[PDB]
Design an enzyme around this catalytic site. Structure first.
Site, mmCIF file in Angstrom:
data_model
loop_
_atom_site.group_PDB
_atom_site.id
_atom_site.type_symbol
_atom_site.label_atom_id
_atom_site.label_comp_id
_atom_site.label_asym_id
_atom_site.label_seq_id
_atom_site.Cartn_x
_atom_site.Cartn_y
_atom_site.Cartn_z
ATOM 1 N N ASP A 59 -21.533 2.094 -28.586
ATOM 2 C CA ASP A 59 -20.938 0.813 -29.009
ATOM 3 C C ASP A 59 -20.509 0.895 -30.467
ATOM 4 O OD1 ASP A 59 -23.861 0.816 -29.682
ATOM 5 O OD2 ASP A 59 -24.076 -1.363 -29.271
ATOM 6 N N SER A 60 -21.407 1.478 -31.285
ATOM 7 C CA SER A 60 -21.260 1.607 -32.718
ATOM 8 C C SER A 60 -20.058 2.446 -33.140
ATOM 9 C CB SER A 60 -22.540 2.164 -33.310
ATOM 10 O OG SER A 60 -22.810 3.426 -32.731
ATOM 11 N N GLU A 61 -19.679 3.492 -32.367
ATOM 12 C CA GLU A 61 -18.491 4.245 -32.760
ATOM 13 C C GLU A 61 -17.255 3.374 -32.581
ATOM 14 O OE1 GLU A 61 -17.633 7.123 -34.456
ATOM 15 O OE2 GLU A 61 -15.546 7.377 -33.790
ATOM 16 N N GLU A 97 -6.147 -9.916 -9.440
ATOM 17 C CA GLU A 97 -7.236 -10.888 -9.367
ATOM 18 C C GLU A 97 -8.079 -10.769 -10.636
ATOM 19 O OE1 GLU A 97 -8.318 -13.398 -7.280
ATOM 20 O OE2 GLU A 97 -6.709 -13.225 -5.792
ATOM 21 N N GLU A 134 -9.314 -3.365 1.716
ATOM 22 C CA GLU A 134 -9.776 -3.607 0.333
ATOM 23 C C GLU A 134 -10.774 -4.760 0.346
ATOM 24 O OE1 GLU A 134 -5.537 -4.425 -0.728
ATOM 25 O OE2 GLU A 134 -6.256 -3.756 -2.696
ATOM 26 N N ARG A 179 -1.269 -18.010 -10.601
ATOM 27 C CA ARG A 179 -0.537 -18.053 -9.329
ATOM 28 C C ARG A 179 0.124 -19.388 -9.046
ATOM 29 N NH1 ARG A 179 0.047 -16.123 -3.854
ATOM 30 N NH2 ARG A 179 0.340 -18.030 -2.627
ATOM 31 N N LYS A 193 -4.352 -4.662 5.315
ATOM 32 C CA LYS A 193 -2.898 -4.524 5.318
ATOM 33 C C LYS A 193 -2.457 -3.341 6.145
ATOM 34 C CE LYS A 193 -2.495 -6.483 0.770
ATOM 35 N NZ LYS A 193 -1.979 -6.334 -0.613
ATOM 36 N N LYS A 201 -12.025 -8.323 -0.978
ATOM 37 C CA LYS A 201 -11.215 -9.456 -1.446
ATOM 38 C C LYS A 201 -11.879 -10.085 -2.648
ATOM 39 C CE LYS A 201 -8.706 -13.563 0.147
ATOM 40 N NZ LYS A 201 -9.147 -14.787 -0.533
HETATM 41 O O1 LIG Z 1 -4.916 -16.685 -2.538
HETATM 42 C C1 LIG Z 1 -3.656 -16.026 -2.452
HETATM 43 C C2 LIG Z 1 -3.842 -14.522 -2.315
HETATM 44 N N1 LIG Z 1 -2.575 -13.838 -2.034
HETATM 45 C C3 LIG Z 1 -2.545 -12.477 -1.645
HETATM 46 C C4 LIG Z 1 -3.539 -11.588 -2.039
HETATM 47 C C5 LIG Z 1 -3.461 -10.248 -1.657
HETATM 48 C C6 LIG Z 1 -4.536 -9.290 -1.949
HETATM 49 N N2 LIG Z 1 -4.393 -8.016 -1.550
HETATM 50 N N3 LIG Z 1 -5.560 -7.379 -1.865
HETATM 51 C C7 LIG Z 1 -6.412 -8.230 -2.501
HETATM 52 C C8 LIG Z 1 -7.709 -8.099 -2.971
HETATM 53 N N4 LIG Z 1 -8.393 -9.130 -3.485
HETATM 54 C C9 LIG Z 1 -7.834 -10.344 -3.435
HETATM 55 C C10 LIG Z 1 -6.536 -10.549 -3.014
HETATM 56 C C11 LIG Z 1 -5.808 -9.472 -2.494
HETATM 57 N N5 LIG Z 1 -2.440 -9.786 -0.910
HETATM 58 C C12 LIG Z 1 -1.480 -10.642 -0.540
HETATM 59 C C13 LIG Z 1 -0.363 -10.041 0.309
HETATM 60 F F1 LIG Z 1 -0.813 -9.158 1.198
HETATM 61 F F2 LIG Z 1 0.287 -10.962 1.017
HETATM 62 F F3 LIG Z 1 0.551 -9.408 -0.433
HETATM 63 C C14 LIG Z 1 -1.461 -11.970 -0.945
#
Ligand SMILES: OCCNc1cc(-c2n[nH]c3cnccc23)nc(C(F)(F)F)c1
Length: 308
Positions: free
Chosen positions: A31-33, A166, A109, A132, A282, A111
């Site tokens: 941290d210090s550096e 996010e 992934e 958003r 996806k 969320k």
């Molecule tokens: O609440 C609105 C969130 N919108 C979207 C979020 C993500 C998203 N992709 N991966 C994530 C991981 N964590 C949170 C949100 C997403 N991907 C899309 C899409 F597929 F339509 F493009 C829309």
């Protein structure tokens, strides 16, 4: 004074250490550096302000400049997700891709339970950050977003792109903030998401800067300047470009793979340093997404499994 050598040395080092601390999870100096070099660069910038630059490591600590909160239209509307609540919902989603376009790989992934943001880059420079909002119009929170270390002020390629991320407060950081809040007779934050919201909704970026916020980048508005042929590849591409992404992403060959991923992260979510409220699934290939397209509301090529 000429000083260019020492300024560039400090930018090289402070960018190096900030990337190691906030993007990798492996610091290389104490941290210090980092605290010693940053105080020096701040002092050079105080005494020799001609050295200050839009993308200095000093940007991170917030300045006098206030977030406007002006209503600003996203370059491209931020897509909204359809939801799934079980395996049947997911087999219906899988069945309807496979009836149309045939058998696909999925990208799975975590969320991230955060605040969705657009991060607009011009010639590779961070220039605008919006909430958003309604998906089309957001609020300009640029000055506060700049203090988040996981957001590059400068990309490795000069791209005109708008990434979607996010923004979040790490749970451990949320808990010690509520500790500080409880100890100082302040009403507590409800969860990481509300704490990250409150700190982003600040008029004071210095105050945002002392909050331990981060980001995961999930998408980009335009894949023209990207060699990626899939979502898995676009995130690896985003890594090489200077962006922070979620490492827990997985390519699965099928819906059994999808459910297998959900099963793991139901029983692994506890141990994460951040809140999640689902799994985003996806169709991985970019051409296949284009082939699946959209309803009036959402992508047909993407679904969010929501935790019970
Ligand atoms: O609440 C609105 C969130 N919108 C979207 C979020 C993500 C998203 N992709 N991966 C994530 C991981 N964590 C949170 C949100 C997403 N991907 C899309 C899409 F597929 F339509 F493009 C829309």
């Amino acid at each position: 004074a000429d000083l260019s050598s020492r300024v560039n040395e400090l930018h090289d080092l402070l960018n190096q250490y900030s990337y190691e601390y906030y993007v990798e999870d492996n610091p290389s100096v104490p941290d210090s550096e980092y605290d010693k070099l940053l105080h020096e660069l701040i002092k050079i910038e105080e005494e020799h302000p001609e050295y200050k630059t839009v993308d200095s490591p000093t940007v991170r600590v917030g300045g006098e400049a206030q977030a406007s909160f002006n209503k600003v239209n996203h370059d491209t509307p931020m897509l909204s997700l359809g939801n799934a609540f079980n395996e049947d919902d997911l087999r219906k989603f899988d069945q309807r891709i496979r009836e149309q376009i045939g058998n696909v790989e999925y990208m799975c992934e975590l969320k991230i339970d955060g605040l969705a943001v657009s991060l607009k880059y011009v010639d590779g420079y961070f220039v605008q950050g919006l909430t958003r909002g309604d998906g089309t119009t957001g609020e300009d929170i640029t000055e506060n977003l700049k203090t988040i270390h996981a957001i590059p002020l400068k990309m490795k390629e000069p791209l005109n792109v708008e990434v979607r991320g996010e923004a979040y407060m790490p749970r451990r950081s949320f808990l010690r903030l509520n500790e500080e809040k409880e100890k100082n007779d302040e009403q507590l934050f409800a969860n990481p998401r509300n704490a990250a919201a409150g700190s982003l909704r600040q008029l004071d970026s210095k105050l945002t800067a002392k909050r331990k916020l981060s980001v995961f980048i999930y998408s980009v508005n335009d894949f023209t300047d990207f060699n990626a042929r899939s979502q898995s590849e676009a995130l690896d591409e985003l890594d090489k470009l200077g962006f922070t992404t979620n490492k827990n992403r997985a390519r699965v060959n099928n819906i059994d793979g999808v459910l297998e991923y959900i099963e793991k992260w139901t029983s692994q979510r506890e141990s994460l340093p951040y809140d999640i409220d689902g799994i985003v699934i996806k169709v991985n290939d970019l051409d296949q997404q284009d082939e699946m397209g959209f309803t009036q509301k959402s992508p047909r090529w993407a679904i969010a499994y929501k935790f019970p």
